[PDB]
Design a protein around this nucleic acid. Structure first.
Length: 796
RNA sequence: UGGAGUGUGCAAUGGUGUU
RNA sequence: CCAUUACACUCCA
């Protein structure tokens, strides 16, 4: 129960499309790579000066240890060589000096056989060695980590003015991926926020938005102090780099330091012969304790400093304006970047005998045919998705709900969301819903104004107690408010009442589209069915009872608190499959693995038996969030749990489980070779594009699928990896099943980027966050919904 | 908080020689 | 050990 099934076959269904994946062919030898561990004298050091130290070391020990040989360096504690150093395997101490004295230690750790990697790529070995991948990646990263500024898995460089005292930098993501019979170099383009190489005296003017310096409070000092504290600066009156720790209250004119107290102005006047044209401005507290103060005039901001401070609205907007590119642009500039590749003249790449193809990889894709969408009414219209999108016009819900009793709680200020607004909104909404097959019969039996979160619970309690058969409460909100979270908390977990929140700006002005989507959400929330997949147009999987599960875990920031990770698992409740039930669990901080999964799956199965009056003969389980290195872990526990949930349900019940992982967190971009295939303004690949060759895993069952229409930028094709399969799916059947499951998402009239169960799981998970706001098992009750909410699709 | 899509945040950066 | 760490575009009936 810990070995993923091999690729059963390749796919044939769909229309052929000629693509180009941003992968580049790598030719690697079968040599043994020698791995050494390093340790520098200052255990805490910037990863750049570590590289400088290492290269200085390699250069200054050419007659004793190194020579023609060039070792690649991880940046932390790992060094790699193509051939064994004349060191043996015992620790060796070497002194290195820099324009300071460093003492490094090198010791052999292991050997990295590329032959094993070759066997893995050929299928001789079922599993791929990780150390090989890591080593190769280090080799590829060495030089660009020296010539450029490494951030995560990307590299950045300068020459873009933003204007927030910061600049925008462009760069490229680079990783190494195993393929069939070969390794691939994955290059993609990216950008990030940096600090502009400025003189501090102008950085002040940018931060406070003074036009220049000629325009001469305490708050002005504080706001600058926040932005500058923690950054590095360089001396211009000699070179030497420091780190800003604070900003003065005493200007250089009236600041003193040791003993005879000399003023910074007078000190720079006597010692540094500087006029100091700005004697009145604050002084940069540098180092610590001991006074080391330097005025703004002599200080410049060092280049290459990344920003972490959350971006201003204008920063984000401007950056998107300066990053927004259609697929052909990204493609062309990636090609442009690999025109400058020249990996065959990079001495470190040459060292390990590696070659890289300077042209993008040609992969062949198949555009799957979209499923037919069935609607209800007496029209019984059948919608056909064109380019991943169909329409909600001249069509009625498959199963429309009659809203007989509903209320309106407006938490927006009465002045901004007036009565005429509410009345008109009601009229239009009732029209749209009437045409949608979800007739809102009468006027709202209740429509009042409220304010603050504290009014939520007493109000809803009044609504539920007073009005018989209350189905829905429409909640008008004045933008971002704690009122939303309170409304969801009370409505979903406390009282069990259906809820639709609406922004006031969407009430002030009517839009048939917005009202339509609103009606979708309302209909679903009230227990209705918007549409179903055409039963005739479905894979044979549905010939037997089958349940579809989705699962997702979200985590709090890594730095703090007992803040728990929350796991959500949803499951289909019909053989369409349209209706889903949700289960939530609070679990240990930062653990990407579902522990209570057995109980949750048990609950979902029990609900399935209560609904269909059948037992699922198959279990199609989509899970999102799990990365590669976690597979063996996840697949070990969760799978068992599922089986546990099957064996503890009844005595000999063991349905065929299909464990599939979904990820968008990758840089695999697919482009059109034929410009006539480019869809839309962004020129992305058509919805339904499937790739299962060339750039995929050499042994195991996985495939790329882009099931959505790309509106802006470059599409992110979802990657699917099959970790288990008792049902023994063929490639085509599973790809098609996934594609059609992408069409069962109720919140819109589109095919989304991932299957509906995973998406729902994400929604429920995100909802739990709102449920938690204002000891483990205490408010683990906070994420549990009401008895009248359990079986509902409350999660929008 | 009508919705989808894609951009940037995921813990990494940093303790340094005179003033 | 200590210091710092969700918004925004583009679209739609």
């Amino acid at each position: 129960a810990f070995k993923p099934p091999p690729r059963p076959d390749f796919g044939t269904s769909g229309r052929t499309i000629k693509l180009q994946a941003n992968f580049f062919e790598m030719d690697i030898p079968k040599i043994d790579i020698y791995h050494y561990e390093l340790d520098i004298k200052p255990e805490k050091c910037p990863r750049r000066v570590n590289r400088e130290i290492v290269e200085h070391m390699v250069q200054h020990f050419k007659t004793q240890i190194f020579g023609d040989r060039k070792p690649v360096f991880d940046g932390r504690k790992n060094l790699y060589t193509a051939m064994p150093l004349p060191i043996g395997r015992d620790k060796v101490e070497l002194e290195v000096t820099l324009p300071r004295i460093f003492k490094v230690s090198i010791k052999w750790v292991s050997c990295v056989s590329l032959q094993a990697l070759h066997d893995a790529l050929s299928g001789r070995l079922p599993s791929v060695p990780f150390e090989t991948i890591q080593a190769l990646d280090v080799v590829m990263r060495h030089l660009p980590s020296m010539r450029y500024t490494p951030v995560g898995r990307s590299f950045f460089t300068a020459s873009n003015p933003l204007g927030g005292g910061r600049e925008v930098w462009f760069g490229f993501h680079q990783s190494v991926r195993p393929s069939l019979w070969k390794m691939m170099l994955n290059i993609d383009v990216s950008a990030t926020a940096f600090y502009k190489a400025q003189p501090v005296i102008e950085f002040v003017c940018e931060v406070l938005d003074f036009k220049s310096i000629e325009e001469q409070t305490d708050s002005q000092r504080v706001k600058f102090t926040k932005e500058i504290k923690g950054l590095k600066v360089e001396i211009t009156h000699c070179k030497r780099k420091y780190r800003v720790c604070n900003v003065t209250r005493r200007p250089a004119s009236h600041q003193t330091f040791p003993t005879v107290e000399c003023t910074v102005a007078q000190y720079f006047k006597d010692r540094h012969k500087l006029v100091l044209r700005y004697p009145h401005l604050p002084c940069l507290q540098v180092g610590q304790q001991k006074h080391t103060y330097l005025p703004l005039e002599v200080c410049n901001i060092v280049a290459g400093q990344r920003c972490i401070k959350k971006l201003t609205d204008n920063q984000t907007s401007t950056m998107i304006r300066a990053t927004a590119r259609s697929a052909p642009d990204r493609q062309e500039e990636i090609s442009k970047l690999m025109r400058s590749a020249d990996f065959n003249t990079d001495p470190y790449v040459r060292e390990f005998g590696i070659m890289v193809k300077d042209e993008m990889t040609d992969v062949t894709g198949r555009v799957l045919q979209p499923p037919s969408i069935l609607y209800g009414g007496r029209n019984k219209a059948i919608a056909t998705p064109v380019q991943g999108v169909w329409d909600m016009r001249n069509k009625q819900f498959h199963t429309g709900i009659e809203i007989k009793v509903w209320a309106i709680a407006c938490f927006a200020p009465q002045r901004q969301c007036t009565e005429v607004h509410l009345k008109s909104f009601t009229e239009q909404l009732r029209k749209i819903s009437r045409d949608a097959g979800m007739p809102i019969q009468g006027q709202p039996c209740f429509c009042k104004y409220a304010q603050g979160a504290d009014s939520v619970e007493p109000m809803f309690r009044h609504l539920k107690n007073t009005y018989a058969g209350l189905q829905l409460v429409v909640v008008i909100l004045p933008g971002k408010t704690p009122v939303y979270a309170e409304v969801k908390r009370v409505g979903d977990t406390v009282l069990g009442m259906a809820t639709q929140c609406v922004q006031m700006k969407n009430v002030q002005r009517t839009t048939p589209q917005t009202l339509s989507n609103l009606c979708l959400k309302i209909n679903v929330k009230l227990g209705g069915v918007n549409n179903i997949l055409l039963p005739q147009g479905r894979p044979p999987v549905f010939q037997q009872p089958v349940i579809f599960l989705g699962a997702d875990v979200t985590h709090p920031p890594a730095g703090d608190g007992k803040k728990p990770s929350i796991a959500a698992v949803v499951g289909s409740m019909d053989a369409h499959p349209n209706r889903y039930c949700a289960t939530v669990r609070v679990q240990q901080h930062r653990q990407e693995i579902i522990q209570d999964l057995a109980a949750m799956v048990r609950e979902l199965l029990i609900q399935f038996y209560k609904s269909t009056r059948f037992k699922p003969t198959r279990i199609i389980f989509y899970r999102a969030g799990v990365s590669e290195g976690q597979f063996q872990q996840v697949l070990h526990h969760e799978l068992l749990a599922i089986r546990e949930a099957c064996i503890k349900l009844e005595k000999d019940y063991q349905p065929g489980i299909t464990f599939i992982v979904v990820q968008k967190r990758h840089h695999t971009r697919l482009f059109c070779t034929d410009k006539n295939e480019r869809v839309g303004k962004s020129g992305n690949i058509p919805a339904g594009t499937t790739v299962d060759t060339k750039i995929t895993h050499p042994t195991e069952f996985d495939f790329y699928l882009c099931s959505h229409a790309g509106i802006q930028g470059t599409s992110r094709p979802s990657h699917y990896h099959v970790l288990w399969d008792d049902n023994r799916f063929s490639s085509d059947e599973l790809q098609i099943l996934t594609y059609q499951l992408c069409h069962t998402y109720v919140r819109c009239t589109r095919s989304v980027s991932i299957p509906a169960p995973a998406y729902y799981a994400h929604l429920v998970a995100f909802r739990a966050r709102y449920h938690l706001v204002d000891d483990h098992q205490a408010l683990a009750k906070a994420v549990q919904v009401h008895q009248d909410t359990l079986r509902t699709m409350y999660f929008a």
